Structure formats: C-alpha cells, structure tokens
Amino acid sequence: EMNLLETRRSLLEEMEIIENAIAERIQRNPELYYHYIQESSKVFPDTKLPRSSLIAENKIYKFKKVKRKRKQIILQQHEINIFLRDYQEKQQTFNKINFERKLQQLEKELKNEDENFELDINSKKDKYALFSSSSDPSRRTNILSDRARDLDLNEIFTRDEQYGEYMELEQFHSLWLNVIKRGDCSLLQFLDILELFLDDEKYLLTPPMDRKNDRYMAFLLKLSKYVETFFFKSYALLDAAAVENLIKSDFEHSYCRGSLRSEAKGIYCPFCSRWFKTSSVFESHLVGKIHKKNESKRRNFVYSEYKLHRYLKYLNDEFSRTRSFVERKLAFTANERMAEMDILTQKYEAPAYDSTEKEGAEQVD
Amino acid sequence: XXXXXXXXXXXXXXXXXXXXXXXXXXXXXXXXXXXXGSVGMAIQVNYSSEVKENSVDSDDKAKVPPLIRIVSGLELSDTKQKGKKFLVIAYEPFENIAIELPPNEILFSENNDMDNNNDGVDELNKKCTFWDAISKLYYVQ
Amino acid sequence: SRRDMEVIKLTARYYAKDKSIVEQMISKDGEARLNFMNSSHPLHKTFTDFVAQYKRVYSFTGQEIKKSKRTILDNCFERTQYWEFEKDKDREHDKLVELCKIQFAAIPWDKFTQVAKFDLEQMRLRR
Ligand SMILES: [Zn+2]
C-alpha cells in the first residue's frame, strides 16, 4: 500500500519549506524576531538576546534593513504564528508515523494510463508558493501568503489598540463607574487605580474596593481576561502555553505558599486576606475549615487577580504608552483631537503593504 | 552607464598610473602535457619568497592574482617581425612574461565546466588557471 | 510528468535501501525506462536528491523530533543569519573580481620579455 517513506519524506520537506519561509521573513525585516525576542526576554529570563546595535540598526549581519510599520510587523507575526501551527501539526503526525519482484511488480503497474498528456510542475512549486511573500495579488499588492490569505488583524485588534500600541481601557473605566456607584472617578484616576496591579503587594494590601465585594470581583475577572487576551494577541510569536504554565506553576508553588512575607505581620494569604505570626500557624491554617471554604469559593477570582497582576507587569510599556496617550488627547483642543483621531483611523484602515514600498534597499554595517 | 563610464575610466587610469614596476624576470617552468583527447601546455611560474614583498602590504590589489592574456605580435615596441601569439602573464611588481604559440590551437577545450558565470577577467583565466597564493605558484593550462 | 516522477521516486525508494535491486533490474529487464540511472541523463541529479532524502528518513527512524516553538524560531533566525553571511561572501567576491577587471584592463600587454615557446579542479582544492 502507501509507502510510509514517501509520506515521512513529504513531511520533512514541508517542515523544511515552512522553516525557510519564516526564515525569509525574519530576513527581510529582523524586527519580526527582535521585537518578539525582546518581550520573551522579560518572561523567560534565561533567553539570550542579540547585540543592541543589531536591534537598533535593524540588521542581522551586515545589511541594515528598512524599518517597517507596526501593522505589517504584527501581521507577519500572526502569519508566522499559523505557519508554526502547521509545522507543529506535521511534526506531530510524523512522530506518530515514524523485494525485487515487488519492484518490478509496481514498475509494471506504473505503465497504467500511458496516455496522460499533462505537464506536472506543482508539488514543490505549489508549496514553496503556498508559503511565500506576496502570494495573493497578481504580482505585488498583498504581503500575505496564499496560506493565510484571509488573515485580517482588524478582526483581532480594535482601532483604539492600534495593533498593540495601546490598550483600550475607557470601556473598563465605564464599567468601573458602574461598580463604584459614583462619578468621582476619572479616566486618569482609574488608570492610577490599575497601577496598583504593577506592584506585587499593593493590589493586595491597598485594594480599590473590598476584595470580597461582588461587583468588584466580577469587574476584576472581566478586566483580567481582557489584559491576558491582549497580551497574547500582541505577541503571537511567543509560545502561549509555555507562559500560561509558567504563571500557573508560580501561582501554585509560591503565591499560595506564603509568597508574600512581612517582617512584622508574617505571612499574608490571598484567600483569607489575613496575616499570620509564623509559618507554623500559617501551615496549620491551610487545612482549617475557613481556608478550605475560601480557597474553595474564591479560587477562580484569586487566580484571575494574579494573572491580571503578572500580565500587567509584562505589559508595563504598553500601560505607560497608553496612559501617556490619554494625557495627550486630554490636553488637545478640538481640532487637534479630531486630526489625531483621523490619524488613528487611517492607521487602522490602511493596507499592511503599500504599492510604494522598498525591496532590496539594504545599507551596510 | 555614463557615470559608470567616467568612474571606471578614472579608476583604470589611476590604477594604471600607480602600477609598481621593478621589471624582474620571474622563473617559468614550461612542460609538455597530455590528457584525454589531445595535447595541452602547462606552465609553472614561481614568485618571490617573502624577500621584497615585506615592505608592501597595504591591501592595494594585493588580493589580485596574476593575470594572463593572449597577445598578437602585430604590435611591438620595435615592430620588425610578427605573425604569432604570446601567452603573456603579469603580476604587479614583477615583470611581464611571454610564451610563443605557433600552433593555431591547443587545449582550446569545449565547455569544460558546467557554465557557471563568475567572469573574473575572462573565460581563459577562470577556465584554466590556478593561483597557489600560499606558496606563490601560478599554474596555467 | 507523473510517470517519470513516480519511477524516479520508486527506484529511489528501493535504491535507498539496497542499491543492489536496481543494478539487477537494469540487467534483467533492459528497458529505456530507467535511462536516468546514468549521470548522463539530466534527471539523474534530482534522483541523487530524492535518494539522499529517503536515506535521511532512515536516519532517525525510531527517534521523534521534539522541537519547541522557541527553538524553531531561534533556528529560523540562525538560518536567516547564514543567508545574510553567504550574501556578504557573494558581495566580496564580486568586489575582488571588479578589482581584477580593472587591473587587467590597466596593464601594459606590450611589455614583452619572452623566454621559450611550445584536472585542475581537483587541484584547486586542499589535501
Ligand atoms: Zn487562608
């Protein structure tokens, strides 16, 4: 029947093709990797990152490549994302898959249908093509490959997020007003509230509201979810599962194990919101009916809070960037604010590749 | 091609001017060769043994290997007799060298390699020359 | 071309395991079908590819590939780097060639001083 050798072969070949594609990409615009890698650096500390000079000059060896706009970088990153998905799949199936009389036997049946007048140049060409730059238009209109021809970022990012530049928190300011049952809270004071979650202890010991309040816990859930999805949305290239598991293990091994310690009050517990003299009473409190109840009711919330914490930490640069944006827009006039909005809009509804872009304008060094 | 023309002419003129010339006759080692299916000539030219090249090492065409060209005797400083070709071999400091080729054609092969295009100087040089730069031995056949 | 492809890949499949079944087939049948076995027939080259590839599949049979996302990325970056390097070598070469053309064009081919009158590929290497 089907000779597995051929199948495994085609698999290794396709894997090669994909690696070559995302490598060509990483070649034309090194930022694609650089960007990614930098973020990775602050999640998995061990990661080795390139020389700063390379990053800045946007070069990999000698040639400094043209700087690309954000929308395109992100696009290609999501494309490479699906590529890596394909690759992972093929690698999987492959792992699950890995005489003379028969030679003439098959060579005889190969004589079948001799009159098959047709040119066959479509195995490596249809694949190579299936994964290359500009595979959609007639010649050069759309950077997206035929593989991901229906990939659209605007269905993943809103206009106010600007493909990861900012995160839209106005909505959450609304919900928040609804939560505090007043209006004493401004967008900026709300952001001031969010800042608490950059600290390892503030969001825990100086809470905006009582952490056992319903409205509050619900809000926090929604917000947390948003921040996380935004995080992975803005950094396709990093292994999502890796990050998730890292955080989960940090949660189990440290956070819920008296990770918060004070020289005065001892050990704080996220679930019971109480301190403890020594580690001894702390341990014999983790079996008590109280802590069982709480850890059994408020588990999801505590975990979500924690995620909001660490994901907001990983996004400190975006948080700051947005807060800045807020203050700017706020200090605008009417005409100014209008023109700025115009700009965000144009950036939002613009082709990721312009008919007037450069290809092969490399400088040296 | 205009700018490239002026520029090229320039570089060639300058380079033609600063050409060092000690006019020292090197030592050639001609030898009748044969392979298959005809007969070809092979020359073994030896160069200095780090004797005088110790004073000039400023990457000025130092990377450039010796060059060969086939010249017709129709043009000479004396213009007396003529009618045969010479396989001239040249290197910046050392003096030029020639080898008379009465036979109309020898070793003039037919697509030896598989048509790869790095013209270097010409089909002749890439096709049939070797420059042992580590030992300073130029072979030509 | 499906026929040619299929026979190349099949004789390549068998040729990848024994190399003796084809050398026997050639003498047994006597068909102008396997004319690609000789390095003369152009397609032969691509053949040398396929076999190699199959030979490769025989390499890690019984071994799984456990490359992670991080790693795959790092790898593609390093490949990129390589390509850039190679590109640079090509550039340098072009430059040197240019120099040569200049000097060749710029020396006196009339400064004659003759004396007398009248395989290198494996030689242009090192061993
Ligand atoms: Zn507790």
Swiss-Prot record, chain A:
One of its GO terms (molecular function) is RNA binding. Its main location: nucleus. It is found in: Nucleus. The keyword Isomerase does not apply. GO terms for biological process: mRNA 5'-splice site recognition; mRNA splicing, via spliceosome; U2-type prespliceosome assembly. GO terms for cellular component: nucleus; Prp19 complex; spliceosomal complex; U2 snRNP; U2-type prespliceosome. A zinc finger (Matrin-type) spans 267-297. Keywords: Metal-binding, mRNA processing, mRNA splicing, Nucleus, Repeat, Spliceosome, Zinc, Zinc-finger. Belongs to the CWC complex (or CEF1-associated complex), a spliceosome sub-complex reminiscent of a late-stage spliceosome composed of the U2, U5 and U6 snRNAs and at least BUD13, BUD31, BRR2, CDC40, CEF1, CLF1, CUS1, CWC2, CWC15, CWC21, CWC22, CWC23, CWC24, CWC25, CWC27, ECM2, HSH155, IST3, ISY1, LEA1, MSL1, NTC20, PRP8, PRP9, PRP11, PRP19, PRP21, PRP22, PRP45, PRP46, SLU7, SMB1, SMD1, SMD2, SMD3, SMX2, SMX3, SNT309, SNU114, SPP2, SYF1, SYF2, RSE1 and YJU2. Belongs to the SF3A3 family. Present with 3920 molecules/cell in log phase SD medium. mRNA splicing factors, PRP9, PRP11, and PRP21, are necessary for binding of the U2 snRNP to the pre-mRNA in an early step of spliceosome assembly. This is Pre-mRNA-splicing factor PRP9. It comes from Saccharomyces cerevisiae (strain ATCC 204508 / S288c). The lineage of its organism: Eukaryota, Fungi, Dikarya, Ascomycota, Saccharomycotina. The gene is PRP9. The chain holds residues 1 to 378 of 530 of the full protein.
Curated annotation (Swiss-Prot), chain B:
This is Pre-mRNA-splicing factor PRP11. Belongs to the CWC complex (or CEF1-associated complex), a spliceosome sub-complex reminiscent of a late-stage spliceosome composed of the U2, U5 and U6 snRNAs and at least BUD13, BUD31, BRR2, CDC40, CEF1, CLF1, CUS1, CWC2, CWC15, CWC21, CWC22, CWC23, CWC24, CWC25, CWC27, ECM2, HSH155, IST3, ISY1, LEA1, MSL1, NTC20, PRP8, PRP9, PRP11, PRP19, PRP21, PRP22, PRP45, PRP46, SLU7, SMB1, SMD1, SMD2, SMD3, SMX2, SMX3, SNT309, SNU114, SPP2, SYF1, SYF2, RSE1 and YJU2. Interacts with CUS2. mRNA splicing factors, PRP9, PRP11, and PRP21, are necessary for addition of the U2 snRNP to the pre-mRNA in an early step of spliceosome assembly. Belongs to the SF3A2 family. Its main location: nucleus. The chain holds residues 101 to 253 of 266 of the full protein. It is found in: Nucleus. GO terms for biological process: mRNA splicing, via spliceosome; spliceosomal complex assembly; U2-type prespliceosome assembly. Present with 3460 molecules/cell in log phase SD medium. One of its GO terms (cellular component) is nucleus. GO terms for molecular function: RNA binding; zinc ion binding. Keywords: Metal-binding, mRNA processing, mRNA splicing, Nucleus, Spliceosome, Zinc, Zinc-finger.
From Swiss-Prot, chain C:
SURP motif repeats lie at residues 7-47. It is found in: Nucleus. Present with 2490 molecules/cell in log phase SD medium. mRNA splicing factors, PRP9, PRP11, and PRP21, are necessary for binding of the U2 snRNP to the pre-mRNA in an early step of spliceosome assembly. Belongs to the CWC complex (or CEF1-associated complex), a spliceosome sub-complex reminiscent of a late-stage spliceosome composed of the U2, U5 and U6 snRNAs and at least BUD13, BUD31, BRR2, CDC40, CEF1, CLF1, CUS1, CWC2, CWC15, CWC21, CWC22, CWC23, CWC24, CWC25, CWC27, ECM2, HSH155, IST3, ISY1, LEA1, MSL1, NTC20, PRP8, PRP9, PRP11, PRP19, PRP21, PRP22, PRP45, PRP46, SLU7, SMB1, SMD1, SMD2, SMD3, SMX2, SMX3, SNT309, SNU114, SPP2, SYF1, SYF2, RSE1 and YJU2. This is Pre-mRNA-splicing factor PRP21. The lineage of its organism: Eukaryota, Fungi, Dikarya, Ascomycota, Saccharomycotina. The gene is PRP21.
